[PDB]
């Protein structure tokens, strides 16, 4: 076998401790670059003029931040959606002032995570598995795209992409509520049904299976030792589990089919989160949450507030305070 | 920055005490007759 053939065989080998593969060939350097730049920046990057008004915001640890406040700060509003790689700056100092690290990191990462999805397909293929774990992964991925790429495209600037930091994330969420009323958006509501529901179903499955474990151990040892890796027998009694759950609610509200059940467990949070992603991705083009501001009116025409109007007041506080020196004209249009 | 001066010893013991607990249990498990 020639060198290229050997190399292909290695890359796609099922025996590597961590699978490489062709998606891996792109994934590994891009993820490494994004990771290294992210760590260095998070520790040591100088303040970044996120909103392009010469008002640099400090994100790194060495420059006054802790873990909760720190961030890799989004690139300058002056840049908008322009491609700002290192070689477009006159110097690393300019590059840093303008938030270059953010673009390097989020582009390398979006590419790398995409290739992560693909790689999940690839290994499933090499191992003779069914292919759709990558489809489940597409939901968190879609979300990442929504907040790092799509929302910036729609708003015309990577300066409005989600910051790489904990407090930065909260900042993103609050400004988002101010301008899109995302809480009142049915796709976000489906996303909440997705993760609340995912949590519920996680606890439920976990507890039903744990509740029906077949006795294989003594009271002085962990029950986990009653399962052995690769045993062909199932480790819990699903008939007993279904008897329980079916009696908890009623019989036909419960799954007797493990395949159907696990498919449910995959489908609910994945679809919900798909809708979360699409919610962000469409509010990216300012199709916003429901607006029932002043929707109820009495016989004279007096406004009768509902809880929606209280929400509106909170949003107003957020709106008027956010980026307090960045607007010169009355409408915040992006 | 004017951080809390006990913060360091707090974080240090918070990490070290339970980590050390676990390391003790692990090592004495390994050394038990195989």
């Amino acid at each position: 076998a020639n060198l290229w053939e050997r190399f292909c065989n290695w890359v796609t080998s099922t025996d590597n401790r961590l699978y490489v593969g062709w998606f891996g060939v792109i994934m590994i350097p891009t993820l490494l670059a994004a990771t290294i730049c992210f760590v260095i920046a998070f520790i040591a990057a100088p303040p970044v003029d996120i909103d392009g008004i010469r008002e640099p915001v400090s994100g790194s640890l060495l420059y006054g931040n802790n873990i909760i406040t720190g961030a890799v700060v989004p690139s300058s509003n002056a840049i908008g959606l322009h491609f700002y790689p290192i070689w477009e700056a006159a110097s690393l100092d300019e590059w840093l002032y303008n938030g270059g690290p953010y673009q390097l990191i989020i582009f390398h990462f979006l590419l790398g995570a995409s290739c992560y999805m693909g790689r999940q397909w690839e290994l499933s293929y090499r191992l003779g598995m069914r292919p759709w774990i990558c489809v489940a992964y597409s939901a968190p991925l879609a979300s990442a795209f929504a907040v790092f790429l799509i929302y910036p495209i729609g708003q015309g600037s990577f300066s409005d992409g989600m910051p790489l930091g904990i407090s930065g994330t909260f900042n993103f969420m609050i400004v988002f509520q101010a301008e899109h009323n995302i809480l009142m958006h049915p796709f976000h509501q489906l996303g909440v049904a997705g993760v609340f529901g995912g949590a519920l179903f996680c606890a439920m499955h976990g507890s039903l299976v744990t509740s029906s474990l077949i006795r294989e151990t003594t009271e002085t040892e962990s029950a986990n030792y009653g399962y052995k890796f690769g045993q062909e027998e199932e480790t819990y009694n699903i008939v007993a589990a279904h008897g329980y759950f079916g009696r908890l609610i009623f019989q036909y509200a419960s799954f007797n089919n493990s395949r159907s059940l696990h498919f449910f467990l995959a489908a609910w949070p994945v679809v919900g989160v798909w809708f979360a992603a699409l919610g962000i991705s469409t509010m990216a083009f300012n199709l916003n949450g429901f607006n029932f501001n002043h929707s109820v009116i009495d016989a004279k025409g007096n406004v009768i507030n509902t809880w929606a109007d209280i929400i509106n007041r909170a949003n107003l506080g957020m709106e008027v305070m956010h980026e307090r020196n960045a607007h010169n004209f009355p409408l915040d249009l992006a | 920055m004017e951080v809390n001066q006990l913060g360091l010893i707090a974080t240090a013991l918070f990490v070290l005490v339970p980590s050390v607990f676990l390391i003790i249990l692990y090592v004495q498990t390994e050394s038990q007759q195989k």
Partner: peptide, 30 residues
């Protein structure tokens, strides 16, 4: 000291990733 603490904990976590992965107890079929 704060920065040193944060980075130190992070570094320990990364080392932990390394041992958890390459020095895990190998799964064995029965």
């Amino acid at each position: 000291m704060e920065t040193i603490t944060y980075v130190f904990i992070f570094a320990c976590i990364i080392a932990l990733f390394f041992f958890a992965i390459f020095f895990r107890e190998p799964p064995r079929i029965t």
